[PDB]
Design a protein around this ligand. Structure first.
Ligand SMILES: O=C(O)C(=O)Cc1ccccc1
Ligand SMILES: [Co+2]
Ligand SMILES: [Co+2]
Length: 220
């Protein structure tokens, strides 16, 4: 009944310059997957919401404040604090696929590295065979996860931490509070604090996801 809560139906945003974005929202948080065409500029802006982002595919020139970093897929993240100007350019011959999370909570303090970009904090197995990679700031933890094929599983559990995520490769069955969805590329899920969730990958190919914790769960 409430599947729309945990797995929001995305809206498509189609710009005139060719950028396409898929918007999923639950309450105070929005997830956007963006496809930016070759040699295309994304005009700078600013807003009261904090913004965290990462490249999923391709290479993107990302600008936050005075800083522009060439972002390689899945190897860095950025945080644009509230009202900090930010924009981007796909300066390559290839499409960029990027992810960004926009958010505003009254009790959160949106710190960031002084030059805005986060590098890999640590890579390691979360469960035997399940490799994860962390990017860590005070109030948020990004965790890349690979769920092995042929039965790879994240057992059901709950935690104080809010947890939001998006599938970025392969497929898997995701369950939140008794609602099971077949995740595919771009599918987003939203877990409020203490909401039951789990996952299994029954396919042959491993499945990749980006999972985000407020506040950090593993590296505090
Ligand atoms: O570590 C957690 O808290 C998780 O929920 C991990 C996870 C990884 C991939 C899909 C669903 C949950
Ligand atoms: Co923005
Ligand atoms: Co969890």
């Amino acid at each position: 009944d409430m599947q729309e809560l945990y797995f929001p139906t995305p809206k498509l945003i189609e710009w005139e310059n060719g950028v396409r974005q898929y918007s999923t929202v639950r309450g105070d948080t929005e997830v956007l997957m963006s496809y930016v065409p070759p040699h295309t500029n994304v005009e700078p802006h600013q807003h009261k919401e904090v913004q965290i982002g990462m490249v999923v595919s391709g290479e993107l020139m990302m600008t936050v404040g005075d800083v522009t970093r060439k972002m390689t897929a899945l190897e860095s993240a950025y945080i644009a604090p509230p009202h900090v100007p930010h924009g981007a350019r796909n300066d390559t011959d290839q499409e960029v696929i990027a992810i960004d999370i926009k958010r505003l909570k009254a009790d959160e303090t949106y710190t960031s590295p002084e030059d805005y970009f986060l590098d890999i904090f640590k890579t390691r197995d979360l469960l035997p065979g399940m490799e994860v990679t962390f990017f860590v700031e005070d109030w948020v933890e990004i965790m890349l996860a690979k769920i092995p094929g042929n039965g790879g599983e994240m057992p059901f559990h709950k935690h104080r931490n809010e947890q939001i995520g998006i599938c970025i490769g392969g497929g898997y069955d995701m369950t939140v509070e008794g609602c099971t969805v077949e995740m595919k590329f771009g599918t987003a899920y939203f877990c409020e604090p203490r909401e039951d969730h789990g996952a299994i990958n029954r396919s042959e190919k491993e499945s990749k996801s980006i999972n985000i914790f407020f506040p950090p769960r593993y590296n505090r």
